[PDB]
Every structure is written in C-alpha cells, then in structure tokens.
Amino acid sequence: EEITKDHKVLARQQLQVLARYLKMDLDNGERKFLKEKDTVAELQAQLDYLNAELGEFFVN
Amino acid sequence: RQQLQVLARYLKMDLDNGERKFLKEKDTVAELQAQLDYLNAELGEFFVN
Amino acid sequence: RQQLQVLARYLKMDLDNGERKFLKEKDTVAELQAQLDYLNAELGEFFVN
C-alpha cells in the first residue's frame, strides 16, 4: 500500500507543478462556494426571523 | 494542460466540483432572496425593519 | 527545473551532497596548507627543501 501512496504523492506534486505553471487556482471554486454558503445562512436567518415574527399562517 | 488533465484523471480528482457546488449555492441564494423580496413587497420596509 | 526537483525528491537523491563534501574538503585543504606555511616560515625554504 505504501508504493501506491508514494506514486500518488509524486503524481500530485507533478500536477501541482503543472497547475502553478498554468497559473490556475485549484481552490477558486471551493472559496466561492464557501462564500455563497455563508450568504445563504445570512438570508435564511433573515427569513427565519420574519417567520418567527409573523408566524407561518400569516407568511403563507 | 493535457498533462495536468491526465494527472488529475489518474488521481481521481474532480477539478470542477467546487464550481458545481458554487453554482448550486448561488441558485439557493436567489431563491431565498426572492422569498425575502416578496415579503418586503408585501409588508413594506417600515414594518419589516 | 521544478519537475526535476519533484523527481529528485521522489528518488530520495540529494543533489547538493557533492558540493557539500567539496566545500568540507576545501576547508581541510586550507587547514593543511596553513600548517605547511607556518612550518616553512619557521624553517625556511632552504632547510625544508
């Protein structure tokens, strides 16, 4: 199992070198996703406050 | 780029997973924003604030 | 160069071992030369030869 680990580490480092040469950020998508998930929780919190204030019967 | 694609395929790593999740999250945001916008058009800003 | 560095790291090969040893040897040379120079300044060239 260690041989596979060594080869995977080498391949990952080669891919990292290639990405650095290509000037491509591999974590841009995850960064944006995490920002969007935070915006969702903010909006959900606003909606939850309005439903706790007005009630479900009124809001629906 | 093709060499990097080959390496990613060998490593079983999806390079577009983050963008896929980001686009799903952006759609959820617009849904929630639309609900909030309807409630503000119904109650008005003075009441909601 | 970065690809070659990655390959060397995978092969567990030190690329600067030779230069390290060379620099140690050059220092040993200067120590021995200094001893010889002191003995020649003490005895003189006519006696030493």
UniProtKB/Swiss-Prot annotation, chains B, C:
Domain of life, per lineage: Eukaryota
Post-translational modification remark: 4'-phosphopantetheine is transferred from CoA to a specific serine of the Acyl carrier domain by the C-terminal PPT domain. This modification is essential for activity because fatty acids are bound in thioester linkage to the sulfhydryl of the prosthetic group.
Leftover remarks: Present with 17000 molecules/cell in log phase SD medium.
Similarity section: Belongs to the thiolase-like superfamily. Fungal fatty acid synthetase subunit alpha family.
Subunit note: [Alpha(6)beta(6)] hexamers of two multifunctional subunits (alpha and beta).
Function: Fatty acid synthetase catalyzes the formation of long-chain fatty acids from acetyl-CoA, malonyl-CoA and NADPH. The alpha subunit contains domains for: acyl carrier protein, 3-oxoacyl-[acyl-carrier-protein] reductase, and 3-oxoacyl-[acyl-carrier-protein] synthase. This subunit coordinates the binding of the six beta subunits to the enzyme complex.
Protein name: Fatty acid synthase subunit alpha
Species, as recorded: Saccharomyces cerevisiae (strain ATCC 204508 / S288c) (Baker's yeast)
Gene: FAS2
Boundaries of the shown chain within the full protein: 340 to 388 of 1887
